[PDB]
Amino acid sequence: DRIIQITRGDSTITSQDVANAIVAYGVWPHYLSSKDASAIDKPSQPDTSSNRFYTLRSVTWSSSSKGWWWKLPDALKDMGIFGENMFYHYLGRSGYTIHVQCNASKFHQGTLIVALIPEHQIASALHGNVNVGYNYTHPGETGREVKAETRLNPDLQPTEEYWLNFDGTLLGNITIFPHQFINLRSNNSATIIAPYVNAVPMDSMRSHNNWSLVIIPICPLETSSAINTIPITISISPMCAEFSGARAKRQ
Amino acid sequence: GLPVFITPGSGQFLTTDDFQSPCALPWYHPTKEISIPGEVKNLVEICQVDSLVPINNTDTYINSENMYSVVLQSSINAPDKIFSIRTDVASQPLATTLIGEISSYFTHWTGSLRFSFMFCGTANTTVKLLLAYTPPGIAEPTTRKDAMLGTHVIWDVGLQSTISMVVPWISASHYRNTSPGRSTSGYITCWYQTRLVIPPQTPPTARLLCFVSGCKDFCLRMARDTNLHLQSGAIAQ
Amino acid sequence: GLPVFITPGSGQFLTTDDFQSPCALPWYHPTKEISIPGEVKNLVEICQVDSLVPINNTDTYINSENMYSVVLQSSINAPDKIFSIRTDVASQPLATTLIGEISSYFTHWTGSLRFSFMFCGTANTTVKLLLAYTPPGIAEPTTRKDAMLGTHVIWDVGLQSTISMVVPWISASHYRNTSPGRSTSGYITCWYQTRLVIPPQTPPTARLLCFVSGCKDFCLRMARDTNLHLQSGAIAQ
Amino acid sequence: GLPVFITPGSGQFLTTDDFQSPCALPWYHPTKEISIPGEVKNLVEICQVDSLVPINNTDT
Amino acid sequence: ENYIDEVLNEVLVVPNINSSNPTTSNSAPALDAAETGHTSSVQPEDVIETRYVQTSQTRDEMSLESFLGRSGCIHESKLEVTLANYNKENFTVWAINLQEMAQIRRKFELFTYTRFDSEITLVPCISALSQDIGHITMQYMYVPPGAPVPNSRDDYAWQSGTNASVFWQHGQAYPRFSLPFLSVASAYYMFYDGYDEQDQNYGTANTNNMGSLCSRIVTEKHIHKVHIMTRIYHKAKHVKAWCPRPPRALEYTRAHRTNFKIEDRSIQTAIVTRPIITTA
Amino acid sequence: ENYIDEVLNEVLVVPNINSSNPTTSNSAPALDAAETGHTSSVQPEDVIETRYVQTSQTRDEMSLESFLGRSGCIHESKLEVTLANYNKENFTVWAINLQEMAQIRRKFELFTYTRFDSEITLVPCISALSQDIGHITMQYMYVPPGAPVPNSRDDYAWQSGTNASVFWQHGQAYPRFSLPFLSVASAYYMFYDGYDEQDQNYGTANTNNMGSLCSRIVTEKHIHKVHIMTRIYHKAKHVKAWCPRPPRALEYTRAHRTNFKIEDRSIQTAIVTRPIITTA
Amino acid sequence: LNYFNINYFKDAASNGASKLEFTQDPSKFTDPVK
Amino acid sequence: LNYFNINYFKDAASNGASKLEFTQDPSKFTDPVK
Ligand SMILES: CCCCCCCCCCCC(=O)O
Ligand SMILES: CCCCCCCCCCCC(=O)O
């Protein structure tokens, strides 16, 4: 069918035309077992007060857009209880649920690529012995948009080569990562469920980004109507979050 | 004092040998292994994943996203050709796909190939197309009549927006060289079947996409060094 | 005349190998072994023994016994800090303790740590103190309110004169480098809780001592060479 | 540390020897063998076939 | 039954091909939707008439152990001896990393995490710049992090109380030894999206630190001028991997970084242009 | 069952961690008295709330056999040949003692008594001071106490009627041999609080006397000038130890003595000062 | 047909290449779904 | 998993490293008392 309904905490999401759902690597999120635990203190599980849906700020899709990207869990750094717990502890782990919604009429055409990349390490913009600054990899919920006007501090900014996946690999091979498409003639939503992947059981939440979200328009938007700019909205929900190592607030 | 006899080839360093050697860190105990999702055991799982192919590799769309799509016109009323590529697994333009990149590490290949196409247009737009495959031993077709005399599939677009055809394995031997030189393996072409029809006040063009992946009989052997990468100078430390 | 094949790596001298060699003293019979008390079988028994830590390592008390104790004043009526050190097992000033000295021969470590404090004052003197541990990822606390928000123990002195707190193992991975460089493992501080009260005609100051030892989950691996000793010239024969 | 004794003739290259040597292509799987008519197993089958002899080998 | 198959490399069989007949029905396996992020499952016996064929290929050579179990050069060290100030110079120090040779780096960077044991082989070469070479002996020592690093030819650190060392002399075969999986975590990092505690050194420059490799010449003062060049080869055993990644498309520039920009140079890939798309 | 564990080094398991709950009672395990000379037995599950964790580390690398079973250099002997008075010079004598290299001495002086077997390896090096070296042969002989000590290159003592000897020639591998525990008592002395029968030689200079090690060049007169340097490495097997002692803090000065004073030099340790104790 | 296979060292790292096992045909990559 | 272990010389000193045994956990050092 085309109907879907997801209820995480006190929030519910419905959609009337979707294309199945994706479980990343065929693994459902869960808690941490005692066979793999490293720290010895008792973890804290906020449960329903933190495993809910949070919606970010929207973006505008025009005929001259090129792409956008976000990072996790940096995007939810100030979303209430989750952000407070993240900033009050030292270690943490969680899963995620991503829903992207973008609807148009029956006289529009266009296509998008939605992908989730683990350990996406981007490259620098200039040559020589340069690296990437801290403030430009943590833009918050606004995210990053590829543009052309000159930016400040050229020696710390990342590159704008969207067609090279921002890191030197050809676009079009990105399909190995968990991904989905949005075709305006078929559907208007995408859903990806991702577990926790890392080489360590638990890790610092303010110095490491496990996942990354990338949106790239593969086919340009075109229509003959008077509505030539369409918004795009993203909602994210943590799953099975737990924290450890309580101290004073970092901020 | 056991008498022994030394055979030729002793003391040599063969890169692809298999011998045991003493360890430099006695009594060392490595870290335990936790469960991580996404464990790959064979290279054939990568080759069974679709990826886009740069059909439109002209000079105008050389470094952009326009090289992955082809445009259709509604002002054409004739049986015309749209595009044509070669079916060699390691040749241009499909040498840079996932299956093409992996195949560049070997010399022989066998099995069938799978191609998929997706239509990206308005929901009120209809079209019919013809996809054909030409076995080797003859020149590339130039008219729809010659193209039809072969393995072909007729596609009609509707609620579903994807079609998938296969290229059967037809060769004299059991394997083929990934770098053939002068030999070929055939061609695949696309032609207009009826027309592209649009309603009033609608964009007059549409786009197309192409994917490629291997079937259940794909295989590789005789690993070698790839030719799609090079190192000119020295990497800075 | 058994044919044999020689493999690479033959004839080399590896320091950490394990091979049998002929003896130079055939038919020799070594002396019998009498029973001697105090036989050590593992290095972990040494690491489970308390030792003092030079908390007061300033320039004034650089070569004396005053570097092992800290003085308390009864003229202070405020929530003030007394001392603070880092919890890295191989860093100053706790790098010269028994557990610190032993840990310098390895590269990785894991487990919990135990700290003990002893009060050395007149039997008519009373005090209350606060010992707190701060997990990494944040700056060192400067006020009692920030220090309290963490793992802490409140100590009241009485007939017993010793308290013992532990530092739990909290890290992302399973092991840590004994020489971390830029990373840290946390801090431990001490603050006045209420006051130090003395009767008339009594000395107005008191001293304190600190010990450190490993818990039951302490471990080491990947033995290396220590960095706390050096040889400049030549030892006279 | 097994004591061994080296015998004369070691390290030589004899053309007609028979020894095993390590392979340069590990994990390689050769192509299967189809049936082809005309398999020769011994050289004596060739010697049992008639052939003409140049009796008249003069200069003309 | 198990020796025979692996000796013949007949493990990992491939499915056969079944015959088919003309069909006409309502179900259309050829049609599907690619917006679901899934791969189509159409087989040749669904869209064409096939013949019964007994396949004989085996996919043993595409396994991970076969793919990654080949020796390759990872470093080259050059040491020139000087007859003046003999006890000061004539030593080299290198920091261990598998990110300086294009072939090995590109082969291993196809995944995100890996876990394996190592095997190391050394190939020493001597260049003669005088009438004779004489007797030459060399020593190589492994210095884990935190251990003292020598800064002279006659330093006390060469006594090697606990550090592992190996010796080579002219006329000897190639040295070789093995190493286990030596990491704090449960796997190696080829890509790291994070910083250090000071919010510096973005990338893998902080997580990967395995120590250093040192070398020196043990022979005392002589009257010969020579150059020594040593090459190091590496091969992996008992390999595991996770999360495959797309292959690299451009040339590498720096270690532990993914930068690709080059001064006064246009971007070049492996794609070759065509005059027109209707002619193959 | 026994091969598997030791091959995987999974012997010497470590206890796990048990979960705990909040408590409030009269018994206070945190309080104790340190004047008894005992170590407190408080565990993490007594003062904080813990989680059930299955530990996986093993303490095999901290064993005595692993700790002391590594080769290290203990001596270096230099021999320069002279073409004048060939049969008088060109021999060396050294008295055996493990007290001349800082690393080995400090590692072994962590205990009071020890008992082990030894293993010795030699690394000879030849330095060329002329146009060619030629053919060089060397001999090493072990002289137990009381045996005659040679004082010339052609002495009759080199016949080695009962003394053990070894030979090395250019192009040969490294010599190696083993020694048993050779002492009059049941253990070795690293510290001795006593004198000799004449109330002299305080320390270990009297109890430890294992003999001497001699070497010479066997080749006859030639026309080549060379220098020979040999290094001796030692490794212990079947080790036992008693009564651990604190580690050394300063540099060594003399053998068989614990003196640390140096003329015109202040006392220096490994402790680094701080500006103020309230800032870590 | 057959062959001998004996380990000589006490360490596992010291041994030779691992015995080829399986390919885990089920591919979560092709169909990333439960 | 397993390995061969044969001695070749007649002397015990000639053999290799001793088999790791125990650690004698009971520590008289921690609690020097009967
Ligand atoms: C001479 C020792 C060489 C051993 C290096 C192999 C282990 C390196 C694993 C990770 C290194 C990296 O990814 O840069
Ligand atoms: C070349 C022979 C070297 C053997 C020396 C090892 C035995 C020495 C034991 C006690 C020596 C000492 O403590 O100084």
Residue numbers in the entry:
A (entry chain B): 1 to 251
B (entry chain C), C (entry chain C): 1 to 237
D (entry chain C): 1 to 60
E (entry chain A), F (entry chain A): 1 to 280
G (entry chain D), H (entry chain D): 1 to 34
Source paper text:
Incubation in the acidic buffers for one hour at 4 °C followed by neutralisation resulted in the respective formation of non-infectious A particles (in Na+) and a non-infectious novel uncoating intermediate (in K+), which we termed ‘E0 particle’. Incubation of RV-A2 in KPB at pH 5.8 revealed a novel uncoating intermediate (the E0 particle) with a slightly expanded shell and less permeability to PTA than the A particle. Cryo-EM image reconstruction of the E0 particle showed clear differences between A and E0 particles; like native virus, E0 contained VP4 and a pocket factor. Furthermore, the presence of the pocket factor prevented the side chain of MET1193 from moving into the pocket, as is seen in RV-A89 devoid of the pocket factor. Inside the capsid, the genomic RNA is still fully retained and densely packed in the E0 particle. However, the capsid interior shows a bulk density consistent with tightly packed RNA, similar to the native virion. Importantly, no RNA strands are seen protruding or organizing into distinct helices in the E0 map, implying that the genome has not begun to exit. Of note, whereas in the A particle several contacts between RNA and the inner wall of the capsid are seen, in the E0 particle only the stacking interactions of the RNA with aromatic residues are clearly discernible. Therefore, E0 particles likely mark an abortive branch of the entry pathway that might function as a host-defence.
The 169 rhinovirus (RV) types identified to date are a main cause of the common cold. In many RV types, a ‘pocket factor’, in most cases a myristate, was identified in a hydrophobic pocket lined by amino acid residues mainly contributed by VP1. During infection, the native virus expands and releases the pocket factor and VP4 giving rise to the ‘A particle’.
